[PDB]
Design an enzyme around this catalytic site. Structure first.
Site, PDB file in Angstrom:
ATOM      1  N   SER C 316       0.863  -1.146   0.000  1.00  0.00           N
ATOM      2  CA  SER C 316       0.000   0.000   0.000  1.00  0.00           C
ATOM      3  C   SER C 316       0.908   1.205   0.000  1.00  0.00           C
ATOM      4  O   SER C 316       2.065   1.128   0.423  1.00  0.00           O
ATOM      5  CB  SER C 316      -0.883   0.001   1.240  1.00  0.00           C
ATOM      6  OG  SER C 316      -1.743   1.133   1.237  1.00  0.00           O
ATOM      7  N   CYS C 475       0.290   7.702   2.947  1.00  0.00           N
ATOM      8  CA  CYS C 475      -0.463   8.846   3.460  1.00  0.00           C
ATOM      9  C   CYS C 475       0.423  10.029   3.837  1.00  0.00           C
ATOM     10  O   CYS C 475       0.323  11.090   3.218  1.00  0.00           O
ATOM     11  CB  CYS C 475      -1.344   8.449   4.649  1.00  0.00           C
ATOM     12  SG  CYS C 475      -0.473   7.492   5.890  1.00  0.00           S
ATOM     13  N   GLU C 477       4.001   9.495   4.882  1.00  0.00           N
ATOM     14  CA  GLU C 477       5.351   8.987   5.152  1.00  0.00           C
ATOM     15  C   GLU C 477       6.339   9.721   4.287  1.00  0.00           C
ATOM     16  O   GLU C 477       6.655   9.292   3.178  1.00  0.00           O
ATOM     17  CB  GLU C 477       5.453   7.481   4.948  1.00  0.00           C
ATOM     18  CG  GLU C 477       4.844   6.701   6.096  1.00  0.00           C
ATOM     19  CD  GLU C 477       3.397   7.078   6.287  1.00  0.00           C
ATOM     20  OE1 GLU C 477       2.570   6.628   5.467  1.00  0.00           O
ATOM     21  OE2 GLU C 477       3.098   7.872   7.219  1.00  0.00           O
ATOM     22  N   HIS C 508       6.139  -1.887  13.161  1.00  0.00           N
ATOM     23  CA  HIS C 508       4.825  -1.383  12.799  1.00  0.00           C
ATOM     24  C   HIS C 508       4.001  -1.021  14.021  1.00  0.00           C
ATOM     25  O   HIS C 508       4.330  -1.400  15.143  1.00  0.00           O
ATOM     26  CB  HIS C 508       4.072  -2.372  11.902  1.00  0.00           C
ATOM     27  CG  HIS C 508       4.534  -2.352  10.480  1.00  0.00           C
ATOM     28  ND1 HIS C 508       4.371  -1.252   9.664  1.00  0.00           N
ATOM     29  CD2 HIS C 508       5.176  -3.283   9.733  1.00  0.00           C
ATOM     30  CE1 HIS C 508       4.885  -1.508   8.474  1.00  0.00           C
ATOM     31  NE2 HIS C 508       5.381  -2.734   8.491  1.00  0.00           N
ATOM     32  N   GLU C 609       6.635   2.781  14.031  1.00  0.00           N
ATOM     33  CA  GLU C 609       5.299   3.379  13.986  1.00  0.00           C
ATOM     34  C   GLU C 609       4.640   3.361  15.358  1.00  0.00           C
ATOM     35  O   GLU C 609       4.469   2.305  15.956  1.00  0.00           O
ATOM     36  CB  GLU C 609       4.415   2.630  12.988  1.00  0.00           C
ATOM     37  CG  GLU C 609       4.761   2.916  11.535  1.00  0.00           C
ATOM     38  CD  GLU C 609       4.091   1.935  10.595  1.00  0.00           C
ATOM     39  OE1 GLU C 609       3.518   0.930  11.088  1.00  0.00           O
ATOM     40  OE2 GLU C 609       4.122   2.167   9.369  1.00  0.00           O
TER      41      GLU C 609
END
Ligand code: SF4
Ligand code: SF4
Ligand code: SF4
Ligand code: SF4
Lengths: 869, 86, 869, 86
Positions: C316, C475, C477, C508, C609
């Site tokens: 993605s 989005c 990053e 993540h 993240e």
């Protein structure tokens, strides 16, 4: 008087002489099965697991009388194929067998190569046995196994995968012409390990359990961690997992032997032999896990390492290195603490010679016959300097020489790292062995070798200490080493061991006289009618024009072979990296890098191999004097004289591959004058400045030429200059040369040996010619001398021989080895081999049984100038 | 039936071996290759429970593992972790 | 007023809304087959050949009315599995289906993740369609293909091979516990490319024939040559061979669309639609080989590249990047030469939105529903600065905003790189789009992003020029870029393009409030009963002790996940490296290194993240205030109250995932006092120094924490702080938190958004709280704001909105994006989704159709504070 | 015999597609799915000369290359370079 060999030795040697060289399938079957069963595994680990299984699933063979045990295979003179590396030299034969059609013709290099048909060689199929690669006997019932095992490797063996990418290089076709003409003897993929020195440190220091523990610790430390190293940081983890796998492999392999010993003990009725089998059981059961705790275990452990590595690739010249120093700490404790007598140590050392002698290299006939003459060059170096820069000679080393005297076998060859610091008694001891005419020890210049180490490996940080740890990989392939601190017997001993990958790989034997030939024949190989190089179409109007055209073809040859061989070795290091050797070789374990990814401490090891240097220099000398200086002949006349073999019958017809026989024809007198001028032109090895200046010029040229090239390790090439047996095959493909050498006959031997029958000014003149340049400029320089046994009679004989060696050594001469033989014995043995089964001669960097040496090399050896004093 | 198939057989080369009990040299084929009364079978795939369906060339199937693989009957099995005499 | 969408667009959208998300097997079948057919091939080439085949052997699909063409698969909303990367989330389902037994339970992450049942999602099997990973419809007849395609990958997918080595890390069990509790949302192998910016340069500059020629030239130059690089020198040759292969693949793929277009033209009776078909045939046949020669071809070539890359890995957030600048040269020439009008350009740009909107990411539900809510984050960034440090805004970018106004679709999201140099009219144009409530454009701080670039990538040589080329991967990053010289139309234009691998991979989403929970519950997950961390057994005697234990648990978590995720990506980059992206991404081609071997210019991209930052900070504020400062409650009281959900019914029972309800259970009065103290404690986002100090301290701690760790590329980690949809699943597994947020309910959205219903001091107080630290310390900071439509009425309201953005940007705020909607509308669409098929909302870094968003995120969006003016 | 088998079929999703001629949406399964007289067979492994021996699930053998491999009958073949209409 040389004492008799031990009873065990005699019994095993009696058996040895009857043995046939044998190829079987167990290891190959098991490697293949395990390889594919782990398809998709990380490469290092997959490779380690497949090698581990190929060892630990094999049938372990122990013979009665043996003390030291282990072999490559279940057979004594055993080997197996490596279809994942290469297979073309046998896979068409085997499928033809399975199809019951005629076997394919050999490739050129193989076809022009002779495997000596005597001794243990199986040069022809017989009974239920198939001769593979003109040397190895394989049982017929294994042929289907050979075929099925090889099949999955189509297109993807190192050979075939690297061939695909080699076809993408611009010089591919040029390269193929070079291979087909045998201008370059063979491919690097044939023996991707070897011409190096093994390092026995890790298992001597830790044992296998200890190593696994180390791996577990490293794995806990680094698995999933890269540090700051985006390139190889993550790879460390897989390296240790892989090392753990291969170590478990070696362990289990040793245990199999322990189990076999246990069984043999249980059915043995001779009390003495039974106790011995039980000793073996204990030894093997111990080294499967524990750090060696005595000399027997320690040397047995080095055998396990050694068989381990020579079983993971096709190879020759995996040197044992400086065993007498490595094992001194184990030896001395045992003789100090009442474990062994010197005689018992001598027995293991005699027995050790049998094990090493039986090591076989399964490879194409071009390699096994054309190059190796079957010898596998497990070179054992003696003496030199220790870590602290003092003489390295150990008491154990005298014993090693003694064992080579009592049990006379081709291997291990012994190489004295001659150094001024070496005690006289050891020098004399070694000389007293050399004088026997077994060919060993050979004598190599410690200082020159260290100088080459400092020069060549200086960019990688080679220091005095590591340089002192050097010794010969294979025959004369000066190979990096280092010392490592062995804790044993309450103290630490810095022991030597190798520290590079192969130092005899890259651009393999280039037949330089053949290249000169094609200068003169405008790129056309008149032997075969094939156009090898594009025609230069330069009028050869001057010596310099001719020489420059030679260089041009030499550089082109080197470029295209280098690029293909880089691909060969690169494919191998990426898809077939060492497992056992990557465990053993410093600094793999410290860095968490295997040999493929430059874990070894010194990687400037890849090189360029010349062949027929003297034939070449002598030919230049003749052409220059006869054609260009004196203008007594035209280049055309010279060439025509060469193409017509000076009016003599060719060895293609006579089957005499030396100047020894020369059968005239009708055209004989037409050429008699130019031939005489060719024979009589200044020859290298006579302290004749005319020839020697050309020889000198060549050395500066070739140094400069080779260093322009880069290996797959990204390091400059350098010159390796030996002949091995290669002067045979390459001499064969070369027509008569301007120095008077006739068509199809051998090149000169070695690289600074006089050409046959051309040394007419004595040995010292050879010494003088050989050393008009600094031998440290290259890896080596190889001299052969043949003495009549009377020239070295008695202790004074011994000393005279030693003094001869020192004279040369002291001029800087890199190497000299002696035949001490009446050449009439050789002529005789050639007539009736069955009478001289045990007869050994020195060829080039190796000793071999006369009966296993092909006729071309025999003829060559027979003809070498014999010195009666 | 042959020395070559005996546990007491000491491999030597492609044509002959040693008898462990006698230390004498014995042939693999031909005259003198027949086993003696002391014969004990050597472990090979050919006599393993895990081995099956060999073709005419002795190439069979090994079921010693979950995924089956090929094996050869004359393959030494004294060192195979999965061997089990039939 | 907004002009209506083109006829093509309207018809294609009509078809779009009816489509089902469909997984098929063609690409996977072909990848698998080609991979194994080339077993033994050098990995880079084997990989490129396989990707090449999976693309160029697919059925190409073209729809009537389309001008721009291509899709991931033969289906419109199509995708396929990558069992060589991961398969566990479907392969047991598939095999259960073939065996006719019950499908096994989902794992925890997937089970707590909701896929919106509406729109095109297939969350339940029906008729002949199987629901795979609760989202993708795969025809029943392909299940057997799925199974057989996935089987060879057992033990060896990136997933399973990396798990083997992860099991060897000391922290494996700990890591397992973390995944199982969903404290870490998902594994890096799930989507190993993405959250990065594609680079369109090579094909646009050279065309595919041109790139093949370059490959051939490089092959000729370097095949077989290492230079001085023993590590990667030889590997250059294989890289170019690989790039030739993938490039041939991309070419054949385009030819397939041309051939299909040709066929459709031949049966098209409607002349108009026939013309499109013939234009497509020309365009596709042209870009199969030639450098693009107009706007249509150029934008179509970007699609080919984009589809090529999202088809080579599950992923993605492969950002389109600054398409308006990349394509400006092609656009302006066409308008200049009268080849296209702006309206025709706008049509392609409208149609382009459909293409991007239809890109699906086939992955586990935890990813697709838990994180992505189905969006694939192909982010198109606008403006910023050009190579020469001037405004980069192009006239083409206005058209891109216009297209997004006329054709309202979730993708591509538009991202304004807000910069003071940006022309007002472009800013106003962008804002007039944002005020529509489509969620785009979002507004990101060009200066803050460039600063982060210089800080994070400084050690790799990041300069002002490359920094200016940055934009958003996925989005938010922030991803490295660079400018490359595109020659076109007689001029050279420095066009931007991405210059790193993934910037949204590593450790993540870590549910920070959950980690805090387990500090309070001594390592035991009271939701599941499973002991997740080693109990610390510390009396939480002070705020500092509690916070220190949180840090300790955070570092342990980071450590073990990092080590395992390094292995995941390392295995991936070694056995599964990018083919298409390695061609495109500088400096791979220049260096002859692919993405796996650090060919990309910037490799410090791997990160950590966070998730639930504000929920976490607010919880600390509550605990510190209510327990340790005011001592009004004991830590045991707080913990008990949390564990009992403050007496309220849980979301596990009520399925309301916001504070929107609180079914006031009887037992609540028990906790009513502590609950009020929790709700009332200082909250982030009110310019309250008490909460904001904790927030500030968190940022300095987390910066320091992340940079202690190293990625597989050997670079320090940094913080990425977005929520995407992850606050849903991670909220779900988290019990009530000390900030009054109830059990199972979503965390705060984004990373600097105020927690739901806690911002009580105006939008500006949120701006102030958010910027108490320098946002360039990390990759990003994510803020959502919801305005009532009446709040931005009129051109005045457009200016008011732009001014609100400028106020935040000028404070250094990294990002703001808006919903413009009446929340009643959303509550309504939730009751009856069938009635609002085209309704879209902004979630977090993405816009999505309401009907495809799960209830938890719907609830969360509904409850976001609605600002009136 | 279905739109799904026709060369004029335009794929959309798991349940339906378009007819290129009518531009009308058509089902893969069930009522309304049968081919019309204008049917032209779409190239698929199932109708390739190199495809043989399917099983119940349509999984068969591709002999398109010297070395056999498996294939699936409903696999689209318009872009396979070895496809040969039966
Ligand atoms: S069969 Fe008898 S003679 Fe032959 S090897 Fe076995 S024990 Fe020895
Ligand atoms: S289990 Fe071992 S001994 Fe038995 S058939 Fe298999 S490989 Fe041979
Ligand atoms: S042409 Fe006929 S069979 Fe083919 S897709 Fe259209 S309606 Fe169906
Ligand atoms: S050749 Fe191509 S279309 Fe034909 S069966 Fe094989 S994969 Fe299918």
């Amino acid at each position: 008087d040389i004492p008799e060999a031990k009873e065990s030795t005699q019994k095993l040697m009696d058996i040895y002489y009857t043995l046939k060289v044998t190829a079987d399938m167990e290891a190959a079957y098991w490697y293949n099965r395990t390889w594919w069963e782990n398809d998709g595994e990380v490469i290092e680990v997959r490779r380690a697991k497949a090698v581990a299984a190929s060892l630990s699933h094999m049938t372990p063979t122990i013979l009665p009388y043996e003390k030291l045990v282990m072999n490559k295979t279940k057979n004594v003179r055993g080997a197996f194929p490596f279809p994942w590396v290469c297979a073309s030299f046998f896979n068409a034969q085997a499928e033809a067998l399975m199809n019951e059609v005629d076997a394919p013709a050999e490739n050129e290099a193989d076809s022009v190569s002779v495997v000596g048909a005597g001794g243990g060689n199986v040069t022809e199929s017989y009974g239920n046995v198939i001769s593979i690669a003109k040397k190895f006997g394989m049982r017929k019932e294994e042929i289907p196994v050979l075929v099925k095992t090889s099949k999955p490797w189509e297109g993807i063996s190192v050979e075939e995968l690297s061939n695909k990418y080699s076809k993408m290089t611009p010089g591919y076709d040029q390269f193929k012409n070079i291979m087909e003409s045998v201008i370059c003897m063979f491919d690097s993929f044939a023996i991707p390990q070897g011409r190096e020195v093994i390092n026995y440190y890790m298992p001597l220091q830790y044992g296998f359990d200890g190593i696994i523990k180390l791996c577990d610790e490293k794995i806990a430390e680094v698995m999933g961690e890269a540090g700051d190293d985006g390139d190889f940081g993550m790879s460390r983890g897989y390296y240790y997992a892989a090392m753990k796998e291969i170590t478990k492999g070696l362990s289990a392999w040793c245990e199999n032997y322990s189990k076999r010993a246990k069984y043999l003990a249980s059915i043995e009725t001779d009390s003495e032999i039974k106790a011995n089998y039980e000793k073996i059981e204990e030894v093997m059961g111990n080294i499967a896990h524990k750090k060696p705790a005595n000399f027997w275990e320690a040397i047995q452990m080095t055998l396990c390492c050694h068989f381990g590595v020579v079983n993971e690739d096709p190879q020759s010249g995996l040197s044992i290195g400086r065993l007498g120093q490595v094992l001194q700490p184990f030896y001395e404790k045992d003789v100090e603490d009442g474990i062994m007598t010197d005689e018992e140590v001598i027995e293991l050392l005699e027995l050790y010679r049998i094990k090493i002698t039986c090591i076989e290299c399964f490879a194409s006939a071009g390699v096994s016959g054309g190059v190796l003459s079957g010898n596998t060059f497990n070179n054992l170096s003696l003496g030199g300097q220790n870590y602290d820069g003092l003489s390295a000679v150990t008491p154990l080393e005298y014993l090693i020489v003694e064992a080579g005297m009592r049990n006379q076998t081709p291997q291990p060859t012994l190489s004295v790292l001659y150094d001024e610091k070496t005690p006289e008694d050891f020098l004399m001891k070694a000389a007293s062995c050399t004088k026997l005419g077994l060919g060993y020890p050979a004598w190599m210049n410690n200082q020159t070798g260290m100088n080459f180490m400092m020069r060549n490996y200086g960019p990688e940080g080679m220091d005095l200490h590591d340089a002192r740890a050097w010794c010969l990989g294979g025959c004369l392939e000066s190979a990096p080493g280092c010392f490592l601190p062995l804790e044993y017997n309450g103290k630490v001993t810095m022991i030597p061991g190798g520290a590079s990958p192969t130092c005899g790989t890259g651009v393999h034997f280039i037949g330089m006289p053949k290249v000169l030939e094609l200068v003169l024949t405008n790129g056309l190989d008149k032997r075969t009618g094939k156009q090898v190089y594009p025609p230069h179409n330069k009028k050869l109007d001057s010596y310099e024009t001719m020489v420059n055209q030679w260089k041009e073809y030499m550089e082109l040859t080197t470029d295209v072979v280098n690029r293909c061989n880089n691909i060969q070795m690169d494919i191998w290091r990426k898809y077939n990296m060492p497992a056992v050797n990557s465990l053993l070789k410093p600094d793999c374990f410290k860095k968490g890098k295997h040999i493929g990814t430059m874990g070894a401490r010194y990687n400037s090891c890849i090189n360029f191999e010349s062949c027929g240097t003297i034939t070449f220099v002598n030919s230049l000398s003749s052409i220059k004097k006869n054609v260009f200086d004196d203008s007594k002949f035209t280049i055309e006349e010279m060439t025509d004289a060469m193409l017509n073999n000076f009016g003599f019958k060719t060895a293609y017809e006579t089957e005499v591959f030396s100047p020894d026989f020369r059968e005239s024809t009708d055209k004989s007198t037409k050429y008699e004058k130019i031939f005489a001028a060719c024979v009589n032109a200044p020859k290298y090895g006579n302290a004749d400045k005319y020839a020697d200046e050309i020889f000198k010029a060549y050395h500066y040229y070739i140094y400069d030429m080779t260093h322009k090239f880069r290996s797959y390790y990204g390091k400059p090439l350098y010159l390796c200059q030996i002949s091995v047996s290669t002067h045979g095959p390459q001499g064969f493909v070369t027509l008569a040369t301007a120095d008077g050498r006739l068509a199809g006959t051998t090149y000169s031997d070695g690289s600074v040996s006089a050409a046959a029958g051309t040394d007419k000014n004595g040995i010292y003149a050879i010494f003088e010619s050989a050393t008009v340049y600094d031998h440290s400029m290259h890896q080596n320089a190889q001299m052969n001398l043949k003495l009549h046994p009377t020239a070295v009679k008695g202790i004074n004989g011994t000393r005279k021989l030693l003094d001869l060696v020192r004279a040369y050594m002291r001029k800087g001469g890199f190497h000299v080895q002696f035949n001490v033989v009446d050449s009439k014995t050789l002529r005789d043995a050639q007539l009736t081999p069955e009478k001289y089964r045990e007869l050994m001669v020195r060829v080039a960097g190796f000793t071999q049984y006369w009966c296993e040496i092909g006729k071309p090399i025999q003829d060559e050896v027979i003809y070498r100038t014999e010195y009666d004093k | 039936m042959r020395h070559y198939d005996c546990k007491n057989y000491i491999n030597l080369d492609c044509e002959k071996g040693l008898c462990a009990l006698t230390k004498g040299m014995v042939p693999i084929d031909g005259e003198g290759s027949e086993a003696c009364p002391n014969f004990k079978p050597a472990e090979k795939c050919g006599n393993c429970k895990n081995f099956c369906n060999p073709d005419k060339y002795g190439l069979g199937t090994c079921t010693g593992l979950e995924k089956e693989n090929w094996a050869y009957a004359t393959c030494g099995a004294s060192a195979c972790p999965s061997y089990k005499a039939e």
